[PDB]
Write a protein that binds this ligand. Sequence first.
Ligand code: A3T
Ligand code: A3T
Ligand code: MG
Ligand code: MG
Lengths: 136, 136
Amino acid sequence: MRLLYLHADRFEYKTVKPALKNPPDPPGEASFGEALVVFTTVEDGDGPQTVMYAASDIASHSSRLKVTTVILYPYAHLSSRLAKPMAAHKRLIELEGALRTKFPGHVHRAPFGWAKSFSIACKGHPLAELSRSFTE
Amino acid sequence: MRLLYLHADRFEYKTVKPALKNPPDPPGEASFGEALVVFTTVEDGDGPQTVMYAASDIASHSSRLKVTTVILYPYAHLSSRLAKPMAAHKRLIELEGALRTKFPGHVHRAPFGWAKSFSIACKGHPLAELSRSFTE
Ligand SMILES: C[C@@H](O)[C@H](N)C(=O)N[C@H]1[C@@H](O)[C@H](n2cnc3c(N)ncnc32)O[C@@H]1CO
Ligand SMILES: C[C@@H](O)[C@H](N)C(=O)N[C@H]1[C@@H](O)[C@H](n2cnc3c(N)ncnc32)O[C@@H]1CO
Ligand SMILES: [Mg+2]
Ligand SMILES: [Mg+2]
């Protein structure tokens, strides 16, 4: 699993056209104030252990940043060892579930399988943009 | 070299604190309309050939998208095999130079070695977010 942690002043997205033949989530849009936006690329061989490490780290980082909102944003582009779409969707659902057991704020998982437009205003402090790798 | 191609409606950045002991570029800020924003991570063993392939591909993609502005945005976070900072800065300068021989529009290379704030509004079409790897 490869993640990018963007500490944002604001974030929004809208699904546009499907990017998979049959997207497993309905279309949607959402907008947020201050949030940790987590661009999430699920990799081949990510299992439940990987999900658990990611969730713990996101919760830990969120606490450090004093953010009360995390956006789990599926992203195909952080890796060249992607898990297949249905495995990826499952791992992202697990990640959302795991994060809720560790982090007490708003957890929003953006829909999987869509092309999206988005806007972000990313903060400029030294911890505002970090990357993470998890595996098992 | 690992790149992320974001086709933006708008983009802006401001340097905040230095992220290297001695940043090789002066601080600054800039804002843009429609642009191809190229998040650029220089990797160990990127040489002139790698730069040349990247430049050709950026020019090719830009032409396809009909964009007339490219932002070369140094980014430490797309890879876990980074080139050292001074090699990275040199390769980014070369990339800017090479792109100008292949692409006729505005080429802006953002300063290297700074923490930055930024905002982007990214388009939602199927070619609006792509990743690329180049090597030699
Ligand atoms: C395109 C861009 O605007 C958008 N934001 C996008 O990237 N959409 C991706 C993810 O939602 C998802 N997806 C497929 N495989 C994966 C994976 N292995 N890991 C995470 N997501 C995946 O399926 C879509 C097409 O790859
Ligand atoms: C931090 C975030 O807000 C900002 N946008 C940032 O990432 N700053 C990076 C790049 O400008 C640059 N840098 C260092 N090594 C590299 C490299 N190998 N490839 C590209 N840039 C590098 O040095 C800064 C600190 O790593
Ligand atoms: Mg890790
Ligand atoms: Mg390539």
